[PDB]
Amino acid sequence: AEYKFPDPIPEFAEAETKKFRDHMAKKLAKRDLFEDSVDEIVGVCTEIFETFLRNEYGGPGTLLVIPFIDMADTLNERELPGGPQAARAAIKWAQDHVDKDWKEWTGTD
């Protein structure tokens, strides 16, 4: 039969997004490539990243790269600077915290 991934956890989606929001906002404020566009680029990525967590993410093996491309294309569509840069940061932090936090939250190894 075909595998069934665990259902997404809205509680974990909120918990991971808030930690995600704090980390990247401080990170991109240290680069001059964003200037005064700190909040809007942060705001755009937060909603898209949270949307993936609530709907498509269900644990290990579900870290799709499609949402990370969504921010990269959208920012250039909105003329916001650092389109590739913001998506590069977001995919990097998700590879160190999202994988580990899901196992601890669910009690699985």
Binding site: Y3, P60, L64, I91
Partner: protein
């Protein structure tokens, strides 16, 4: 006086196998590939299916995205 060696975990599987990892997906260390085979190294996953065999390759590397002014 110089040789190179790209690390690529190449798997050959029958068409009747079951694949637990989707195409163009990112995996980590000790990520299960089939019921009896586990990936030694993680990373990008690319799968090609032939007439009688399914070829699964595991790619480990740093993923970057194109820019408007990049001339790749």
């Amino acid at each position: 006086d110089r040789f190179f060696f790209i690390p690529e975990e190449v798997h050959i599987l029958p068409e009747s196998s079951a694949i637990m990892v989707e195409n163009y997906s990112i995996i980590g260390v000790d990520t299960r590939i089939t019921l009896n085979i586990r990936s030694q190294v993680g990373g990008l996953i690319r799968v090609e299916r032939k007439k009688k065999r399914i070829e699964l390759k595991i790619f480990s590397g740093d993923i970057h995205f194109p820019d408007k002014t990049d001339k790749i």
